Structure formats: C-alpha cells, structure tokens
Amino acid sequence: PSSSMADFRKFFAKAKHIVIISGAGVSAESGVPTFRGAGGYWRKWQAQDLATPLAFAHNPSRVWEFYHYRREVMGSKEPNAGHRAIAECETRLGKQGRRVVVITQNIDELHRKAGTKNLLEIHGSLFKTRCTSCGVVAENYKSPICPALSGKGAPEPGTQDASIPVEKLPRCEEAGCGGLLRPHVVWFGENLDPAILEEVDRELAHCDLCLVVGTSSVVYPAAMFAPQVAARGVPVAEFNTETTPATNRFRFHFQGPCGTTLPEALA
Numbered sequence: 001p002s003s004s005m006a007d008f009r010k011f012f013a014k015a016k017h018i019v020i021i022s023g024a025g026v027s028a029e030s031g032v033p034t035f036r037g038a039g040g041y042w043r044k045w046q047a048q049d050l051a052t053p054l055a056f057a058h059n060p061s062r063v064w065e066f067y068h069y070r071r072e073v074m075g076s077k078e079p080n081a082g083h084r085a086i087a088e089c090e091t092r093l094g095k096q097g098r099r100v101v102v103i104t105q106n107i108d109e110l111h112r113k114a115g116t117k118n119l120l121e122i123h124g125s126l127f128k129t130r131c132t133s134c135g136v137v138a139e140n141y142k143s144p145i146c147p148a149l150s151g152k153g154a155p156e157p158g159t160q161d162a163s164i165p166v167e168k169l170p171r172c173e174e175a176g177c178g179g180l181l182r183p184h185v186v187w188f189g190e191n192l193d194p195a196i197l198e199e200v201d202r203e204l205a206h207c208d209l210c211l212v213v214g215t216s217s218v219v220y221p222a223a224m225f226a227p228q229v230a231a232r233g234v235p236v237a238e239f240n241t242e243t244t245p246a247t248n249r250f251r252f253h254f255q256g257p258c259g260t261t262l263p264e265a266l267a
C-alpha cells in the first residue's frame with residue numbers, strides 16, 4: 001500500500017463522510033493496559049483468558065477483580081495526541097457539514113474523554129454494567145464499584161483471588177431486581193449487539209474515506225470492517241505501528257505511533 005501522506009491528504013480534503021476505526025494501539029499510547037499481545041498480563045492471564053462468559057460463570061469474583069483494576073487505573077490516563085487529532089477533526093469537519101464517526105474496539109472511553117461525539121463503542125465499556133437478571137444497562141463510574149472490591153484487583157503474579165461471594169459483587173440497583181451485574185463488555189464468543197452492527201453498517205456503507213488506526217486487525221468481526229469498505233472501492237488508510245494481516249487490502253499504510261502520524265494526517 002501507498003505511504004504517500006500527500007495522496008492521502010488529497011482524499012482527506014474532499015471526504016464528506018469519514019469512518020475512523022480504532023483499536024488497542026490508540027489506548028496503549030495513553031498507557032492503558034490492553035492485556036493483549038504486548039499489552040500486558042494481569043496476574044498470570046491475558047484478556048482472552050478472562051473476557052469470556054465461561055470465566056465469569058466459573059469465577060465471577062476474579063473477572064470482576066480484573067475489570068475493577070482496569071476501571072481504577074483509568075483515573076490517571078489521558079487521551080493522547082491521536083485521540084485529540086481525531087476529536088479535533090470531527091469538530092472541525094462538522095462545522096463544514098462533513099461527518100466524522102469513530103467506531104472503536106476499545107472499552108476505556110478515552111475517545112469520549114477527548115471530545116469525540118459520533119462514537120460507536122462496539123465492545124461496550126469498562127464504565128457500564130449489565131444486569132444478568134433483568135438485562136438493564138447502566139453507566140457506572142463508582143470508585144470502587146462495590147465495597148468488597150476496595151483495594152482488590154492487584155495485578156502482580158501470585159496475587160490470590162479475593163473470592164468475593166456473589167452476593168457482595170456488584171448488584172443491580174433497579175427497584176425489585178438485585179441481580180448480579182456483569183461488565184457491559186462484549187466477551188470472546190459473544191456476538192456484537194445487532195443494533196450496534198446495524199449502526200456500524202450504516203456508516204460503512206456511506207463513508208467515502210476510512211481510517212483504521214491502532215488495531216492489529218485480528219479481533220473479529222471488527223477486523224472485517226475496513227476490508228469491507230475497501231472492497232466497496234473506498235480508500236482505506238491504515239495507521240499502525242506494524243503491518244497486519246489486513247494491510248494489503250488497503251490503499252494506504254502509515255507506519256508509526258498514531259500520536260505521531262494522525263496529527264499530520266488529520267490537520
């Protein structure tokens with residue numbers, strides 16, 4: 001694929017509807033642990049070990065400790081220059097009648113924190129809960145999310161399970177429910193919400209330029225979104241620290257941290 005910033009910016013100057021797909025690399029550049037690839041371990045595990053319905057069924061306390069840790073670390077994390085360039089682009093183009101929408105794989109809300117408004121969080125959020133009894137989805141920023149998790153979630157190998165009884169894990173506050181909450185995060189083996197897929201597809205089907213930023217293009221179905229756009233004939237530019245299995249489907253590839261390349265690309 002082309003690495004001509006000038007040719008990319010010619011498309012950018014005329015694009016009326018830009019889709020920006022983002023993944024864990026953008027979060028890693030803010031120091032967010034992503035628990036995938038080089039993104040870290042929590043105790044002896046990575047995300048694919050704990051972000052599953054079976055893990056939560058068998059050890060909901062351990063899975064809650066993991067997500068508790070990740071919630072609490074966010075207080076010290078800020079959007080990076082990549083997030084900011086993306087948010088600034090949306091704002092600037094929006095005044096010109098031009099649409100920018102972010103479709104993110106990330107669950108850390110840093111695009112929101114940066115001021116992105118047109119945002120599809122296709123895997124949910126660290127800061128939402130879903131009740132396993134009544135299905136209600138709620139925003140939750142409480143620190144700690146429940147008292148039993150105070151001081152828990154420590155990430156060092158050999159840390160013992162808190163083994164919090166399910167009654168003392170986060171519980172639904174809807175009147176008359178009281179069910180056990182789970183993170184409102186899409187886990188491996190679970191499909192994405194059909195309403196979110198419909199919203200994704202509406203943007204993919206109408207965009208005239210697509211950027212795929214900081215993603216390894218190995219998590220499906222998200223990894224197929226930018227290839228679908230390219231197959232429609234629309235230019236796709238990949239901004240990533242390395243090539244990926246999807247790179248050769250795209251019109252452009254710009255190697256480097258997104259905080260380095262995106263401020264120039266989206267100026």
Ligand SMILES: C#CCNC(=O)[C@@H](NC(=O)[C@H](CCCCNC(=S)CCCC(=O)O)NC(=O)c1ccc(C2(C(F)(F)F)N=N2)cc1)c1ccc(O)cc1
Nearest residue numbers: 047051107123185186187188189190191192218219220221
């Ligand atoms: C990493 C990696 C690669 N794994 C994958 O891509 C797998 N994908 C998956 O498993 C994804 C979900 C991925 C969620 C990722 N969540 C993240 S990144 C949020 C943060 C998690 C955290 O950090 O805590 N799900 C699916 O791909 C999926 C698709 C269809 C169904 C379905 C059908 F009927 F529609 F076909 N049966 N109902 C179910 C699941 C996968 C595995 C095998 C397959 O054949 C297809 C997909």
Ligand SMILES: [Zn+2]
Nearest residue numbers: 131134172177
């Ligand atoms: Zn409930």
